């Protein structure tokens, strides 16, 4: 029980670093955001 | 010159409709109009 609990706790502790450290970790959600922004900016720029 | 109120305006033939406000744009003596990314005049130097 104690070893399993400690392994879980250390693994959960490393998630903060893994997300914050590797830049392209949230890349799928950032991709959604960027696609919307890019499409609207393209629409605006097409008015010229 | 009416400011801060939606008006039809005509500046040296540049016709439009909107609210005119005092600007902080740093124009240069050879510039009469300022343009946005859509190629729409969004800042104008008053002729007089």
Curated annotation (Swiss-Prot), chain A:
Chain spans, region Heptad repeat 1: 1-48
Domain of life: Viruses
Function according to Swiss-Prot or TrEMBL: Subunit of the fusion protein that is processed upon entry into the host cell. Mediates fusion of the virion and cellular membranes by functioning as a class I viral fusion protein. Contains a viral fusion peptide that is unmasked after S2 cleavage. This cleavage can occur at the cell membrane by host TMPRSS2 or during endocytosis by host CSTL. In either case, this triggers an extensive and irreversible conformational change that leads to fusion of the viral envelope with the cellular cytoplasmic membrane, releasing viral genomic RNA into the host cell cytoplasm.
Protein name per UniProt: Spike protein S2'
Organism of this sequence: Severe acute respiratory syndrome coronavirus 2 (2019-nCoV)
């Amino acid at each position: 029980q104690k070893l399993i609990a400690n392994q879980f706790n250390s693994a959960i502790g490393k998630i903060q670093d893994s997300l914050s450290s590797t830049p392209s970790a949230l890349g799928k959600l950032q991709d959604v955001v960027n696609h919307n922004a890019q499409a609207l900016n393209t629409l605006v720029k097409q008015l010229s | 010159l009416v400011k801060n109120k939606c008006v039809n305006f005509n500046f040296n033939g540049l016709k439009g409709t909107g609210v005119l406000t005092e600007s902080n744009k740093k124009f240069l003596p050879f510039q009469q109009f300022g343009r946005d990314i859509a190629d729409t005049t969004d800042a104008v130097r008053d002729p007089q």
